[PDB]
Amino acid sequence: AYTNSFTRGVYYPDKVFRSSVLHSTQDLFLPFFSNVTWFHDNPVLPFNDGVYFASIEKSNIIRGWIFGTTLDSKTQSLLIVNNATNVVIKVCEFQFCNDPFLRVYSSANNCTFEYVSNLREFVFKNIDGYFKIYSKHTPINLVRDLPQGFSALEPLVDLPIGINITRFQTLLALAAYYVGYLQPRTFLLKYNENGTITDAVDCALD
Amino acid sequence: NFNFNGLTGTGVLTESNKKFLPFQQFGRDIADTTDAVRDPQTLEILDIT
Ligand SMILES: *[C@@H]1O[C@H](CO)[C@@H](O[C@@H]2O[C@H](CO)[C@@H](O)[C@H](O)[C@H]2NC(C)=O)[C@H](O)[C@H]1NC(C)=O
Numbered sequence: 232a233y234t235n236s237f238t239r240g241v242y243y244p245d246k247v248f249r250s251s252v253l254h255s256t257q258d259l260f261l262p263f264f265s266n267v268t269w270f271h272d273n274p275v276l277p278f279n280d281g282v283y284f285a286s287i288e289k290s291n292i293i294r295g296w297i298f299g300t301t302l303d304s305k306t307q308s309l310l311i312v313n314n315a316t317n318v319v320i321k322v323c324e325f326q327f328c329n330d331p332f333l334r335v336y337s338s339a340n341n342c343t344f345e346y347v348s349n350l351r352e353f354v355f356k357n358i359d360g361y362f363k364i365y366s367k368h369t370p371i372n373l374v375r376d377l378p379q380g381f382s383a384l385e386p387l388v389d390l391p392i393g394i395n396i397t398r399f400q401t402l403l404a405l406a407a408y409y410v411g412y413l414q415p416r417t418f419l420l421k422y423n424e425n426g427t428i429t430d431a432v433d434c435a436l437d
Numbered sequence: 438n439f440n441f442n443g444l445t446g447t448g449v450l451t452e453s454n455k456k457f458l459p460f461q462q463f464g465r466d467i468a469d470t471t472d473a474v475r476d477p478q479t480l481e482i483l484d485i486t
């Protein structure tokens with residue numbers, strides 16, 4: 232099933248404060264009114280050149296994500312698990328199970344990295360050997376459909392970790408979520424007097 | 438004159454009112470010249486004029 236992106240999925244493309252200015256950036260963005268896939272299952276989804284991911288939950292139903300070329304111990308796989316107490320980010324040649332319900336993996340080997348710390352919205356990029364997470368949690372009127380209107384995702388996590396990713400999955404506890412793929416688009420971004428991005432033009436749209 | 442993490446420049450390092458988000462390290466002018474900087478030790482925001 233599919234849904235429109237409804238102009239969501241903009242994020243800050245630089246770690247640079249800009250304000251009272253319109254800035255053009257050619258970058259990997261979710262296009263305006265793009266064709267996002269919709270879910271309520273957790274398939275071996277493609278990752279392509281990057282993902283917008285969003286979910287609406289009232290009881291913390293999702294518990295994270297996993298990424299790689301294989302999702303098998305032949306290669307390094309990136310994992311983000313949000314357990315009952317912590318966000319745990321790991322890169323290992325994991326041996327994952329048939330469904331990452333929360334029993335995500337049997338074992339881990341050849342590890343190279345670790346990091347530890349409403350509508351939920353995320354963007355994942357894996358470019359030139361970095362991996363980046365941007366996010367926002369957005370309060371909304373209903374529990375099960377992607378809203379109209381605009382807000383820009385702030386950078387959350389930023390990792391110099393060099394993985395190759397073509398597949399990803401969603402972790403679940405024992406809810407409506409949406410997946411959209413980034414395209415290399417020029418966006419004209421409106422940075423307001425507080426330097427927050429309040430609006431954008433997708434120069435490819437129309 | 439100053440050097441912030443290798444950002445050479447000159448100016449008057451006025452204490453900034455600008456509301457840097459916690460990830461942002463530098464501010465830029467409409468030209469690419471640097472307009473503000475986060476101090477790498479105190480992590481306050483300074484204007485560069
Ligand atoms: C959620 O994950 C964190 C990892 O970030 C777990 O933290 C470890 O907890 C044990 C005690 O149970 C400590 O000895 C370790 O030092 C902790 N590791 C880190 C990196 O902090 C945490 O236990 C997990 N939560 C639950 C409920 O199991």
Ligand SMILES: *[C@@H]1O[C@H](CO)[C@@H](O[C@@H]2O[C@H](CO)[C@@H](O)[C@H](O)[C@H]2NC(C)=O)[C@H](O)[C@H]1NC(C)=O
Nearest residue numbers: 303304305306307323324325338339340341342
């Ligand atoms: C960890 O990854 C390495 C590759 O980086 C694997 O290395 C092979 O290990 C076996 C057993 O030691 C050797 O016979 C091969 O020659 C190694 N390959 C290379 C290219 O050196 C290793 O298999 C991985 N770990 C596990 C547990 O499989």
Ligand SMILES: *[C@@H]1O[C@H](CO)[C@@H](O[C@@H]2O[C@H](CO)[C@@H](O)[C@H](O)[C@H]2NC(C)=O)[C@H](O)[C@H]1NC(C)=O
Nearest residue numbers: 251422423424425426427428429454455456457
């Ligand atoms: C710029 O930032 C300030 C916050 O520092 C915004 O002011 C707040 O706006 C909300 C609106 O719901 C009020 O509840 C707060 O009381 C305001 N705080 C202060 C200190 O005034 C302001 O709206 C922002 N401006 C723009 C254009 O985004």
Ligand SMILES: *[C@@H]1O[C@H](CO)[C@@H](O)[C@H](O)[C@H]1NC(C)=O
Nearest residue numbers: 232233234235265266267268
């Ligand atoms: C969305 O994408 C699928 C292919 O992935 C296609 O079959 C469907 O018609 C598309 N919908 C629109 C409105 O473009």
Ligand SMILES: *[C@@H]1O[C@H](CO)[C@@H](O)[C@H](O)[C@H]1NC(C)=O
Nearest residue numbers: 475476477478479480481482
């Ligand atoms: C670095 O120096 C500043 C003072 O210039 C101090 O406030 C800060 O805590 C120091 N950072 C660390 C990590 O010790």
